[PDB]
Design a protein around this ligand. Structure first.
Ligand SMILES: *C(=O)[C@H]([C@@H](C)O)[C@H]1CC(SCCNC=N)=C(C(=O)O)N1
Ligand SMILES: *C(=O)[C@H]([C@@H](C)O)[C@H]1CC(SCCNC=N)=C(C(=O)O)N1
Ligand code: NA
Lengths: 246, 245
């Protein structure tokens, strides 16, 4: 397990006047590279990336029955029209249907939710702030490095959850599929934050390319929703210039 | 039950293709096709056999697990794309025959026969050599049967652990989009011989919103230049029904 600083990559950040970090790890050499060692260890609210552990915990606790469970839309207004539908597990993840996962956390409960974030070594493991908000506005925080450790565990089925439930969540996280490579990933965006205290935007996941696997985690400060696409454009550019997905 | 849709014939005739498309919304209990007779006609599975072969490899422990790497011994293989180490998904996606031939040999005739019976896989005939019965032997399966088989897989209802079915299902993802996932497998038996065409396949399913469509396409083929039609005809149909694209 090694990490090195690669201040080169900074060009793709500077080009777009973005402050953030990319962490990219090659599984076979167990070696990671980042543009910013300090920021890679800095902990931010997970925002919708929390839907990964939350989904796993919901399956393990039985709250989510199985891979085919449909979360039925009860008709009442949701903060996004995208969310105003019936949704599969993948559907609710792809669209980041927060209220689906707020109810899941509610049924998981504080005690099991804390037990699992400790077993998963997930961030600071602080779920203070309300059972259906701690990852959105409460005290939970996780690093880019911790994300890639967590994702590597999931990939290897080594989290303290059934392998079946880890496989279920992995397939729901597939976002791009090609003959030579598969991408599993999850976006996050906490909001634009306050004056002097921007929000955070995330892109985490891993790339299966030939016999190699690359785990990655991107975060950036964000005070303008206009800039959201940059959470994929900068890591994708980085990953292309490494020959991984381009 | 299977019901004929005449409308779908346009895409075949335009291309001078003799083939069938089978499409089933939600379940295999009602399927639509351009050709009732051909929907249930049984053909060599060719590379589509990699799906049951992968499941059986896992169930028997021949494939140790999802992360197994099939190492290349460096000796010539029939396609340059196969001359590399491969994961399970990789070996499926490039249709690395010799990887699956060794799998078949290690599974062996007795176990292969048992699982094909459990899976209701076509005519369940594995004669013709343990490492080639799905390539040039007597094995045959229809488009309708592929749909039934894939539906069982999708539902984790094959006689196989849920874990192993999940592994193979992930290995079969070929298109991911926000609204839908496609799990699929292509096949091409070759160009056949005079008056006896080969067969080309595309089978799979589409998870879209909360709906699932099972599909199975085959055509006669005697010229490899026609091979792109195996995807474009069923894609065109599924795009015109509003399922993908
Ligand atoms: C998670 O990161 C959020 C969740 C908290 O809403 C979802 C929503 C979005 S983008 C729209 C949010 N607008 C806020 N004013 C994403 C995303 O990853 O793009 N995830
Ligand atoms: C399985 O259907 C075959 C396997 C038995 O060889 C592979 C090969 C091809 S096409 C490559 C060009 N063929 C030249 N002989 C496919 C395919 O799905 O297209 N699968
Ligand atoms: Na693909």
């Amino acid at each position: 397990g090694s990490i090195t600083e690669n201040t080169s990559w900074n060009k793709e950040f500077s080009a777009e006047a973005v402050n953030g970090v990319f962490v990219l790890c090659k599984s076979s050499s167990k070696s990671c590279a980042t543009n910013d060692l300090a920021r890679a260890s800095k902990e931010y609210l997970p925002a919708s990336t929390f839907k990964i552990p939350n989904a796993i915990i919901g399956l393990e606790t039985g709250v989510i029955k199985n891979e085919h469970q449909v979360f039925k839309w009860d008709g009442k207004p949701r903060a996004m029209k995208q969310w105003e539908r019936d949704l599969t597990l993948r559907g609710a993840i792809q669209v980041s249907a927060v209220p689906v996962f707020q109810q899941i956390a509610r049924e998981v409960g504080e005690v099991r939710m804390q037990k699992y974030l400790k077993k998963f070594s997930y961030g600071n493991q602080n779920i203070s702030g309300g059972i259906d908000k701690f990852w959105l506005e409460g005290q939970l925080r996780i690093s880019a490095v911790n994300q890639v450790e967590f994702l590597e565990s999931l990939y290897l089925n080594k989290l303290s959850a059934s392998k079946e439930n880890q496989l279920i969540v992995k397939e729901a996280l597939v976002t791009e599929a090609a003959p030579e490579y598969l991408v599993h990933s999850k976006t996050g965006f906490s909001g634009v934050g306050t004056e002097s205290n921007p929000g955070v935007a995330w892109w985490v996941g891993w790339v299966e390319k030939e016999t190699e696997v690359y785990f990655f985690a991107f975060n950036m400060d964000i005070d303008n929703e206009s800039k959201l696409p940059l959470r994929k454009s900068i890591p994708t550019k980085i990953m292309e210039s490494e020959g991984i997905i381009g």
